[PDB]
Each structure stands twice: as C-alpha cells, then as structure tokens.
C-alpha cells in the first residue's frame, strides 16, 4: 500500500483580521468520479486511463484540493482571510471544478479545470490547463508535480483576485 | 478493465457576468439507464444492444456530458458565462436529455437527444440526431467520435443561442 | 443476455417556442410490477404470463414509455412544446397508465392502458386497447411491433389533443 | 414459476370531467398481509389456508384490484370519470378494503370486503360477500372466477353510485 | 406450515349514511411483542408461554383484530358507520390494547385487554377478561374460540356504545 | 427457549373521564440496556450480573412494565382513568424509571427505581427500593415475585396520588 | 462473560415537590469512544490503554453515569428535584463530560472530567481529577472503586450547588 | 492491538461566566481522512505515509483534539470559560483545522494546521506549524510528543486570545 497526500502549506503568523474585510470562502472542489475516488490515475492513451491499485490518496482528492487551495490562497493573498468555511454575508465566493489530475503516457502530468468567483453580483469564470514534467518516473514525483502545478494555478487565481480591488 | 472519459476542452481567459444577461446554467444531462450504467453500449440490431463489461466509463456518463457541454459552451460563447451550477436570477436554464450515445454494428456511431432552453421566459425546444463513423477497430476510436459529435451538438446549441436578440 | 430499448424519435429542427403557448407536460407512465420490471413478458394463457430470462429492457419500461411518448407527441404536434419536465403554470398535464405490453400465445402483441388529460380544469380520460402481429416469431419483432403500436396510440392522443383548441 | 394477473377491461371513447361532479378517485385497495403477499391463497379448512409457492401474482394483488376497479368503474359509469389518482376538489373518494380473495377446498371461490364512499360530504359505507364456482381443476380457472367476482362487485358499486341524485 | 386468519364478517347491505352522524373510528389494536408477532402462543404455566413454530397468523394479529373489530361493530351497531380509517372531525375515537390472546395448559383459551373511547371530550376506559373452552385440543379450535370470544367482547363494546346516545 | 411475561391484572366496569381531573398518562417506563435486553438478569456479586440466554422476556420488559403499571393504576384508582396514551390537556403525567428488576444470588429479588409525577403544575419526585424472596428454585418463581413487587410499587404510586387534594 | 453495572442509589421517601422550585436537569454524560463503548479499560502505560474482552458494562457507560449522577444528586441535595428529563423553563442545567474512568498499571483507579452548570444565565465550569486504590486486584474492585469516586465527585458537585442559593 | 489517547489535562477550581465576555466555544477540530481514520500515521517520504494497522487511536483523533484543546484553554485562560458546547449569544467561536499530526522517518514529529476565531464580530485567522523530536524508539513516545505539541499550540491560541482588549 502507498498513500499520498498533497503537502498543505501555511502563511507564517500574519494573523489577518476582518477589519479590512477581504473575505473569501472556498466551496468544495468538485471532481468527477474517475479522480474523486481514492485511486491515482495515469493517462495511457487519448481517452484511455489507468487507475492505480496500491497508489491511493491519503484523504479524498476533493478535500485535499480544497484545503491546499485555502492554504495557497491564504499564503498568496497577504491581508486576506480565506477559509473553507462560511465567513459572513459580505464574503466573496469561489467554486472550483477539476477535470484532470493525472500523468500521461509521455511522462507528463496534467492539471486542468474551471473556477468561478462571485464578488457582490459580479461573476467571473475561467478555465485552466497546465502541464508539468516528471524528473523521475514514479508516482511520488507524479504527486509532487501535481502539487506544484496546483500551487501554480493557485498563484494564477491569486493574481486574478488581486487584479480587481 | 479499461476506462474511458470524454476529453473536456478548455479556453483561455474568459469573460465576466456583471451584465447578468450573459448567464447560462446547464442542468445535469439526463440519460436512460442503458446509458446511465457505467458500461459502453454497442447497438447490434434494430432494438438489440450489447453493454461491454470490461470497457466502462471512467466516471458516470451523464456527469461527463454535463461537464463537456459546459466546457464547449464556455468556449463558443466567449461573451457568456456557462456553468453547471446556478448563477443568478435572470440566469438562463438549459435542460438536455440524451437518448442515444453509442455505436452501431455497421461501424458507425450515433448521438441523439433533445434540449430545452429558457431565455427570459421564452422556452425553446429542439431535438437532434447526429451520426459519425469510426475508422479504426477499437472502443477508443468510438469514444473519440462520440466526443466529437457531442462537441458538434454543443456548437449547434451555441448557434441557436446566438440567434436570439 | 439480450437487452431491448424502444427507438426514440425526433421532430427535425422545428425549434418550437412558447410564444403561442401550447405547453404539454408528461408525467411518469405508471406501469404495474409485471411490466415495470426489467423482464419482457409473453402471455401464454388467459391469465398466465411468462417472464423472459435473458430478454430484458435496456432501461426500465416506464421511463422508455415516457420518453418515447414525449418524442412522438413532439413529432405529431407541430407547434407544441411537449416535455417530460414541468414547463409552467399554464401547461396542460397528461397522465398515462399502461396495463398490457406483451405478446400472446397466438403470436399477437397487445398494448393497452388509460390516459387522462387536464386542460385548465377540463379533465378528459380515455382507455385504449390495440393489437399488432409479428411477421417473425422473435422477441426482436415483438419489441418492434410494441413500438409501432405505441406510435399508433401516440397518434391517437395527438389527434384527440388537436381536436380541442 | 407461474404468474397470474387479473385482466383489466377497457371501454371505447370515454367522457370528460368539465362538469366536476362526474369525478371519482379510487384510493389504493387495501388487503391484509395474507392477500398482500405475492402468493395465491387456498382456504383448506375453517381458519386454515395454504399459500401457493410457485403460483404467484404477476404484480401485487392490491395494485391489480385498484386498477381493475378503476377500469370497471370507468366502463359502467360512462358519464363519470373514475381514476386511481386525485382529480379535483369536488371529486369523490372511494376507499375499498378486501378481506378475502381466494378459493376454498370445496372447489369454490370467495371474495369479501367493505367499501366507503364520500359523495359531497355524505359518507356511505357498505360491506359485501360473493361466492363463485370454478369448474375445471386449475389455478387459472380460480383467477378467472376471482376476476369475474371482482367485476361483479365493481358493478354493485356502480349501481350504488347511480342511486344518488 | 399452518396459517390462521380470524374470520371477518359483514353486515349485509345496510348502506349506512352519515346523515344521522354516528361515526366511529378504530385505531390500531396495540398488542405486545409476544402476541404481535406471527407466532401463535399457548400458555404452559403461570408466566411461562410457548410460541408455536408452524402455527402462525395469516396476517399480523393487530391488523386482524382491528379489521374484525371494525366488522363486528358495523354488524352490532345498526345505523352506525364504523371504519378503521378517519371519518371526520365529529367522529368518536376508540383505542384498544390486547394483553392476552392464547390458550392455557388446562385447554382454556383466554382473551383480555383494555379499551378507551373518546366521545366529544368524554373519555371512558374499561378492561376486560374473557375465557372459552376448546371442544377439541387443536390450534384450529383455539383460533376459532379466540374469534368467538373476540365477537363476545365486540358485543360488550357495542352495548356500552349504545348505552350512551 | 423459555419466555416469561408479567401477568397484566384487570378490573371490572371502570369509570369515565368527563371530569378531566381524573386523568393520568403513564409514559413508557425506561430501563437500562441490561434490563432493556430481552434476557433475564441474575445478580451474582456486588456489581456482577448474569443474563440468561435461554430464559427471555416474552415481549420487551419496558413495555411490559408500562402496561402492568397502567393496569394496576386503573385498578387501585377506580375514580381515575390511567392510560398508556395521551388523554387530554389537564391530564397528569407519570414518568417512571426502573434501575433494577432482577434476582440475587442469595435467592432474593430486587426492584428499584424512581418516578416523577406532574399534578396540575406541581412536580413530585420519589425513589423506591423493594426486596422479595423467591421460595422455590426456578426462574418462574422469580418472575412471579418480580410481578408482585411491581404491583406493590404501583400501589405505592396510587397511595401517593390519593394523598393530594 | 462478566458484565458490570454502577450501583444506583436512592434518597428514601422524601417526595420533594417543585413548590420551592430548586429544579435540576442532567444532560447526557458525554464520554469519548474509548470509554463510551462496552469495554472496560485498564491503563497499562502513559498513553497506552488495554480494552477488556469479557469484562464489559451491563448498560452503556454514559447512561450509567447519567443515572447514577441523578441518583447521587437527588440523595445529596435534600429539597431539590434532580432528573435526567426536562423539568421546566425555570430549571438549571448541568453538562458533564468524563475523560477517564479506568484503572492504572500501579493498581490505582482514576476518574476525571469536566462539568458545566447554567443557572439563569450564570455559567460555572470546573474540571476534576480523582483517584482511588483497589484493595484486591480485580475488575470487581475496580468498578466498585469507580463508583465510590463517582459518588465523591457527585458530593463535590452537590456542595458547589448548595454554595450558591 | 494497541490503543493510544492524548492525556487530557485539568485544572483546579475554575471561574464562572456571568460576565458573558469570558466565553469561548471550541467547535469540533476537523482533520482529513488520513488523520480521521483510527490509525496512527508515519510519514516515510515527502508525500508517502504509512498507517499503522495495530497501533490505533483509543477514540477518534478529532474528538481527542477537541477535548484536549478545551482542557488546555480552560487551564491557560483562568478568567475565561472554554467549552466544547455552545455557551451563549456573545460567546466566541474557535474553528481549528489540523492538516498534519504524525511523525516522520527522521525520528521527528510534525503538527500543522490553521485556526479561526470570532471575537465580537472580528474574525482572526492564523496558521501554525510545529516540530518535535521523539527520543526513544516507540509509538508511545510519538504520541507523547504529539500531545506536547498540541498543548504548545493551545498555549499559542491562548496567547493570541489574551492579546485582545
């Protein structure tokens, strides 16, 4: 048995308060049943996949993505309070649905999905596709590159958030 | 065991929804139990079909159709915001039913169904049938052609949407 | 294993709108437990039946009847919007209960049931019995003649609908 | 395994319900668990019965009784509208209970029960017992005679209905 | 296997109406778990009982008692409408709980319980104990004497009802 | 397997409840899981007990206690109406808890508990312990003595009730 | 098998009434899953425990603690009405959570937890740790010392209650 | 099978909550399924962990964390009242999430997470990571160090609380 968990990070000891508002609530990262299960997958063909047997998630993938996104956004938004729990009526909402989170026959690892943001009536939706390479052909390197690309797309979302005050 | 999933396309930097009218919600695409089952269907006679036991959907087919439809509509409606979740009050609703999504014994592939749309009170209903050809013997080519036909019908829905004031 | 599904049809590309109203909602085609199951049946005597073993429905019979009736009424009512989903408060309702959907010892295939329609307080109920013959003694021909007689009774209902503007 | 179902009779072109008063709803006919079970009962002594293990109802007996009652009442009440579903506000309600629906060791068949009806506030209650004779040794003849007695009691209910202003 | 059912009776063709009111609703005859089960019991000692193996109830004892009480009260109250279903707001209520329904080591068969009646605020409660003898030592005779004593206590309740207009 | 049940005593012609104040409702007597289990308990040491596997309650002990309490209270309160179901608005409530209902290794039997009563707003709380002696070796004698002690405590409750204005 | 139950006590025949108020409601004694189960435990190390196999609770530990606390508080608060059931709106509330209820490698038996009291807005919370010794190394003595220390902490709570009129 | 539980510390005579402002409620500490499982985790590589099958939590880890946090906060906030249950209206809320609570293959132990607090409308969010060293080979020492780090983080939360007016 081999279980993997996305390394969750933290933003030091900033202790951000809601005095300057800037609230953010993160809903559940919706994921289809071929990634939402406990099985790590590796694209072997154009539409054919392969579910791993003993290479599983430590906790379900959607919860991992939600918590790591909350951590990455809290790190990459200094002065913002981002939480996976409801904050208030003046909070801005974020809904993420992941479409791909696997490797590929060429040794590449793909992340992709869509994210929507509600800011006081203004809704902004955007899809994303990103790729990384494995230095060593292993599930360990696969999950690590997955986490790296997850951090990349979290940084993209943080930039898009900081763009509109 | 082999698993197949329809590739969910994605665009680049998308638009916002502060206009309100550029909103569309794709409710879950309903399919009958012979398509709702996790097995791939192969039409062998006029009313006879065969469900493959070792060739399955990676995730349930209805969720795949809903997600791929949302992605295609988000691509060919750049000024709009198409989502698989509710988006507002003046948001538009799109209810799609799929009656056939399988191949035939003559080496061909069929996709048929219906769809209803609500544009600010006006309800528009349209059925559709489409037929493609898989050129190489294999379920992978069948799934590829199926995804292509699904994208073609999403483009048809986009064209019908753009035909309104 | 041999699974059968009623061939669902379509009405081209009419794109009927609710501007001229003419809404129709189709409730679930209620069917007793000797036909509502997955087992095709063949009347062997006056009250004795025979449930088939490997001759089953692709999807449950009631859902098949509901969807095929929606399709047949959409085809046979040009200018009407017929759906298996609620349309509005000004919609007319239709409730169908099937009593027989099998073959007979003489090679005949029987369809029968009752249908009720609500049009703004005016309720119209009517029973129906119809028969067809099988050119070849086979379950394939049986299901095909069943679909043909289903289309026949759908045409009867469409005429009864078009009778009262 | 042999399955039996009561033949559901049907009339031709029936009437409408714009008058309101010509409305009747047959609630689900209740039978005890010795009749609610899917097995055919054979009364062997005064209080002793035997439930056939290989001779069963095609669908549960209570639903069959409700449907056959609705059909018979729709036949012998041409000016009325009898349905197994609610029909309006001024609609009439018919609650039927069946206490015996089986054959006896002397070669005879028994059908007994009670029924209550609500006519515009006036509640009318009447019990009934009827006995027929099966002439040929077989469960098929028993079911035939049972259906005939059920039709006779439906005719009795129709006569009691027609006796009101 | 030997199943027994309390013979339910009827009151001819009186067709009692609610014009003279006299409504009666019968609640579920509550019975403890040593009689409420499917097992006929036979008192072998002061507090020791014996549950029969193949001598069972055709339908659960409480439903049998409720239906037979409804029938006996409808027979023994000419001009009253007694039902196991709610009748109206002006109806009188009856609640019965049986404590014993078995035979005894001496060949005697005991029935006992308590019944409460609500008539427009006036509540009348009363316990009862009654005994019968078996002419032949058999479960058949046991159930038959049980039904006879049930009719006896039903007659007692009918007298107590007719006592207070 | 041997089953035991406490004999539920019964009186003759009882009284009515038009006075309102002569009303009492016995809520379900609660016992812990070592008494709530269907097995008879035998106290072997100070805190050690043994649950008989083949000597069981005919019906769950708590329901037996509630019914026997209602019967005894109906006997020793002739002017009152004690029931196991709600009786009105000015009705009185009696909540009894039983902590011990078993025999001891010295050949003796124990019954202990508490009870609360609501008399027109005044809440009265009283605990109780009682000890009897079984004279002949056998679980039957134990159950007999247990029922006797239960009747004694019901008489105590009756005496406390009669002590109020 | 060896089952143990905390000896519940009683306060004679005081028959305390609510005329002088002094109500007390006891909520469920919340207990973690290593003590809340049916398994008696014995601390073998600093953080290592040992769950007993055949040394179990007669009824679940939390119910036992709740009932014994109700009894001890009723004994040790003369003139108060303490119950495990709601008493009224003017009642004072008590919430207890136990953290330890086991023995130790040195033969010591530890009880510990926290209790909170609500008296008309004034909330008073307090933790407690207490120890006892076993004269004989046995589970019997263990449960007995547990009950003794439970009585001790009940006396402490009774003193804290009597401190504030 | 070996079970481990974090020792829940306890103080002496604590304070009251009549002031209202000295109130804190610790909602249930949430951990992912790799920590929510009853098994102890041992981090073997960067993203690889191993869950011990025979070394388990005595009770679920999340409940243990909540209880130990409440106890520590009750110790280092003498003037406050910290509870695991709601305490009032002006009460403060503390939502803690734990992302890591396990040891590493270099002989070290990690505890990381986040926590949010609501002080009279002001929401304060802070993450934390802490690392200890187990000196003797054994899961017992690991659990000891884990409890120590948890107490250290509770002290950090107490310090952040005391930093407010």
XYZ file of C-alpha atoms in Angstrom, chain G residues 11-165:
155
model
C -32.961 9.014 48.704
C -35.600 7.227 50.774
C -39.143 8.614 50.589
C -38.606 12.376 50.677
C -41.148 13.133 47.911
C -39.690 16.527 47.033
C -42.066 18.930 45.291
C -41.407 21.876 42.980
C -43.137 24.300 45.370
C -39.729 25.581 46.445
C -38.535 25.225 42.835
C -34.894 24.037 43.004
C -35.081 22.138 39.712
C -32.117 20.398 38.108
C -31.876 18.718 34.705
C -28.975 16.389 33.898
C -27.904 16.117 30.264
C -26.156 13.070 28.817
C -22.733 12.427 30.352
C -20.639 12.726 27.195
C -17.836 10.149 27.071
C -15.185 9.516 24.371
C -15.233 6.347 22.300
C -12.557 4.552 24.363
C -14.810 4.610 27.438
C -18.224 5.070 25.792
C -18.038 1.574 24.318
C -18.946 -1.586 26.176
C -15.315 -2.326 27.059
C -13.799 -1.759 30.481
C -10.283 -0.361 30.111
C -7.139 -0.502 32.263
C -4.258 1.946 31.676
C -1.095 -0.068 31.096
C 1.228 2.858 30.283
C 1.378 6.648 29.995
C -0.774 6.775 26.845
C -1.281 3.044 26.192
C -4.567 1.501 27.377
C -5.997 -2.036 27.326
C -9.637 -2.794 26.473
C -11.037 -5.793 28.327
C -12.513 -8.715 26.408
C -15.120 -10.335 28.683
C -15.253 -7.540 31.299
C -17.978 -5.298 29.891
C -20.615 -2.813 31.003
C -24.114 -4.093 31.724
C -25.512 -0.953 30.061
C -23.512 1.735 28.215
C -21.219 3.747 30.453
C -22.692 7.158 29.625
C -26.241 6.115 30.568
C -24.897 4.572 33.785
C -23.058 7.771 34.705
C -26.114 9.910 33.940
C -28.470 7.780 36.055
C -26.049 7.371 38.972
C -25.370 11.125 38.960
C -29.116 11.827 39.018
C -29.480 9.455 41.975
C -26.456 10.828 43.866
C -27.570 14.440 43.381
C -31.107 13.573 44.491
C -29.644 11.982 47.631
C -27.104 14.737 48.354
C -29.485 17.654 47.656
C -32.366 17.319 50.139
C -35.160 19.567 48.908
C -34.078 19.519 45.246
C -35.696 17.711 42.323
C -32.965 16.343 40.043
C -33.933 14.439 36.913
C -32.414 13.128 33.697
C -35.506 14.546 31.898
C -36.576 18.153 31.203
C -38.418 19.711 34.148
C -39.366 23.246 33.114
C -38.213 26.600 31.813
C -37.050 27.649 35.302
C -34.743 24.625 35.610
C -30.964 24.776 35.984
C -28.877 22.745 33.550
C -25.822 20.522 34.063
C -23.487 19.164 31.361
C -20.814 16.589 32.239
C -18.032 15.144 30.054
C -15.860 12.361 31.506
C -12.254 11.972 30.314
C -11.033 8.976 32.359
C -12.785 6.024 34.001
C -10.239 3.224 34.289
C -7.508 1.666 36.394
C -3.757 2.156 36.153
C -0.643 -0.019 35.989
C 0.067 0.715 39.675
C -3.345 -0.628 40.715
C -4.834 2.862 41.011
C -8.227 3.737 39.509
C -8.686 7.223 38.058
C -11.835 9.256 37.432
C -11.718 12.643 35.730
C -13.763 15.027 33.643
C -15.425 18.424 33.439
C -18.831 19.755 34.452
C -20.659 22.950 33.494
C -23.755 24.421 35.142
C -26.181 27.022 33.793
C -28.204 28.910 36.429
C -30.316 31.653 34.804
C -27.502 32.977 32.623
C -24.696 32.360 35.126
C -22.452 29.599 33.760
C -19.945 27.835 36.026
C -17.489 25.304 34.596
C -14.992 23.182 36.510
C -12.660 20.228 35.838
C -11.966 17.395 38.255
C -9.403 14.615 38.746
C -9.745 11.998 41.480
C -8.062 8.701 42.319
C -8.747 5.594 44.369
C -6.943 2.389 45.273
C -8.006 -1.242 44.868
C -7.728 -3.414 47.969
C -7.870 -6.510 45.736
C -6.548 -6.637 42.165
C -9.775 -7.397 40.322
C -12.218 -5.856 37.883
C -14.913 -6.125 40.568
C -12.906 -3.954 42.956
C -12.097 -1.688 40.001
C -15.746 -0.954 39.194
C -16.534 -0.598 42.895
C -13.801 1.997 43.451
C -15.001 3.719 40.270
C -18.487 4.002 41.765
C -17.041 5.295 45.036
C -15.059 8.040 43.316
C -18.160 8.826 41.239
C -20.060 9.355 44.487
C -17.186 11.542 45.706
C -17.327 13.847 42.687
C -21.127 13.893 42.938
C -20.741 15.125 46.519
C -18.331 17.803 45.298
C -20.875 18.983 42.715
C -23.626 18.934 45.348
C -21.511 21.150 47.617
C -20.805 23.556 44.753
C -24.547 23.678 44.047
C -25.548 24.265 47.682
C -22.923 27.029 47.877
C -24.903 29.452 45.679
C -28.602 29.815 46.691
